Amino acid sequence: MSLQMVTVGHNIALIQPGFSLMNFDGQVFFFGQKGWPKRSCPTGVFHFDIKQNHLKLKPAIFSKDSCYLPPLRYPATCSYKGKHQYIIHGGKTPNNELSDKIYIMSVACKNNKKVTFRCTEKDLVGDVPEPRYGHSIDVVYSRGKSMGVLFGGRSYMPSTQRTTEKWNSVADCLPHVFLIDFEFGCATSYILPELQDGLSFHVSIARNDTVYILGGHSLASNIRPANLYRIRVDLPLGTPAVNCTVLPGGISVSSAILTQTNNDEFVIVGGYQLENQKRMVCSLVSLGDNTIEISEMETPDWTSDIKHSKIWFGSNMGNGTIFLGIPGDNKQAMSEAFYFYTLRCS
């Protein structure tokens, strides 16, 4: 509960709602800039450091073999800790297409704080999921191996019902669950009876064998159900098995931001409660070996801007640290593009 104001460098105009913050061994990087990669920085990914509330978005470079990737604006990212690397999926490219590839990114060399990434385009084979955005992906271990569980979000209408009077309309995807094998990138769909509605902009936690899905906007009915779901999974000798459960103690929030305050215990911060009701109070989620719960914590202090603005966005930094942005009024003496804040919990 340590809010702090922030000032920014000169190129503030590369911060757009729906970026990504990749935390590599203390260092942190910003991905998903606005507009295609300029000539100042051909990779569109920055080393994003901040000292004394002044942050210096510096360019990063890739390897000799990476796959120069477009800046996605709402992808699904997860921390594949098996060396440490990141998985990116889908998103919405600058030209408003939707990608359907896997992007596996790691560090090939960091010498004297001079980083050098490498990213690879891993492709799904089999019952691949359609291209979509706002969805969620988590990695989960069991029996010494691991698999990627993917829960879908929203997407464009299929390639038949596209009409140029509603060409940019979106609907939820069929609430399946996609099991992905990264060792060979193979895809297996699975249907489960406990889940009914399509879910988007939810929160996905992975207790080492069991994934918890909380919150989410249900586009099919324009409501935000408080239905939290637990998903147990096991991979036996043959094809794995999935199971769902519904547990009490729900909450209704969409587009929330997650971070790990303590091992086996997270905090969740303000996303949105209703399309007219933002979320000012934060909730401590107490994970566990087999059970979990959610309580309401002591509403970290805001300011006039955040409590008065209409929207917000951002993400985590990895070390119990949140980065948030604020539009900032334009009916003034030509205010800046965005204002910013950093949240701490220690």
Site residues, other proteins (CB under 8 A): 17-18, 34-39, 42-43, 61-62, 64-70, 73-74, 92-97, 121, 134, 162-170, 200-201, 217, 254-255, 272, 275, 310-311, 327, 333-334
- What is the rounded CA–CA span in Å between residue 230 and residue 209? 11
Count of Cβ atoms closer than 10 Å to residue 251 Cβ:
19
- SS3 assignment, position 223: strand
CB-wise, 74 or 229, nearer to other proteins?
74
Query: Which two structure tokens, joined as six digits, stand for 154?
Result: 């929203």
Tell me the two tokens of residue 215. Answer: 């919150």
The DSSP result for 252-280, as a single string, is --BS--EEEEETTEEEE---EEETTEE--
Closer to other proteins by CB, 48 or 313: give it: 313
Q: How far is the CB of 78 from other proteins (least distance, A)?
A: 20
Q: How far is the CB of 329 from other proteins (least distance, A)?
A: 12
Q: Which is nearer to other proteins, 43 or 316 (CB)?
A: 43
CB of 275 to other proteins, least distance (A): 6
Question: And the tokens for 132?
Answer: 């979509």
Which residues pair with residue 207 across a beta bridge? Answer: 210
Beta-carbon neighbour count of residue 154 at 10 Å?
Answer: 20
Intra-chain end-to-end CA distance of the chain, in Å: 8
Q: What is the DSSP letter of 128?
A: P
The nearest distance, CB 154 to other proteins, in angstroms, is 8
Q: Quick one: 38 or 145, whose CB is closer to other proteins? A: 38
Q: Closest distance between other proteins and the C-beta of residue 216, in Å?
A: 10
Which of residues 254 and 316 has its CB atom nearest to other proteins in the complex? 254
